[PDB]
Design a protein around this ligand. Structure first.
Ligand SMILES: [Cl-]
Length: 37
């Protein structure tokens, strides 16, 4: 039960928390764009 299914779900929840990694490490480029001299 847990190893297999709640495995799958928690290792999706890897992917989403990877995505929010990627997006925040864009946000911290955006702040490059928007910064200091
Ligand atoms: Cl991360």
């Amino acid at each position: 039960t847990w190893e297999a299914w709640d495995x799958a779900i928690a290792e999706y929840a890897x992917r989403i928390e990877x995505l929010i990694x990627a997006a925040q490490e864009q946000q911290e480029k955006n702040e490059x764009a928007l910064x200091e001299l």
